[PDB]
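During the second year of the project, the team shifted from modelling isolated chains to modelling whole assemblies. The rationale, set out in the original proposal, was that interfaces cannot be judged from single-chain predictions alone. As a representative example for this report, we include one of the complexes processed in the last quarter. Its constituent sequences, exactly as entered into the pipeline, are reproduced here:
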Amino acid sequence: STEEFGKILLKVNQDGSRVLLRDVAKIELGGENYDIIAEFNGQPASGL
Amino acid sequence: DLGKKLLEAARAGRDDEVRILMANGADVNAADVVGWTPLHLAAYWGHLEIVEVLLKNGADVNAYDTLGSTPLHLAAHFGHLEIVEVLLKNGADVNAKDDNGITPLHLAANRGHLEIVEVLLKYGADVNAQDKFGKTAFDISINNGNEDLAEILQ
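Output from the structure prediction step:
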């Protein structure tokens, strides 16, 4: 899940505070690539 | 042998076999290889009917396995709300710790079960209690990023 990837520990600071991955990045499910976008009669679609 | 047939039945959720084997004087606190009583198995696999039938026949509600985990630890962790209440009603230690110092609140909090967290708190769970790494249920909720849970634990 995105929740689990978000709470990945990158480092612990001198003052005891933690730097998690969600503190330097946005975590979300998204395409392997975003090149191909299909459309069926103007309506958003996928296909094979 | 008789107590071993009870362990299988408590796991498999057979309501008849548990009651019928109990009539023939089956050990309610029979331990498997890892130290799991029938009450551990019923709490884990979420068999509410068998938890009540076992407790009725004087099952050890604070029986602990070879790593110190109780049926309340298992119920709280795997989100079985009704079983947490039934166990706490039968005098389960709400502030029970396994060898790691992990309490049923730690587990419930970590797995995001808000309804169970509130019941454990109601029955007198120690919010400030620590595990071996010095983590409270509040620390877990902050790290897991659960603001609904964080505001309940303050």
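Strands of chain A lie at 9-12, 18-20, 38-40, 43-45. The CA atoms of residues 11 and 17 of chain A lie 9 Å apart.
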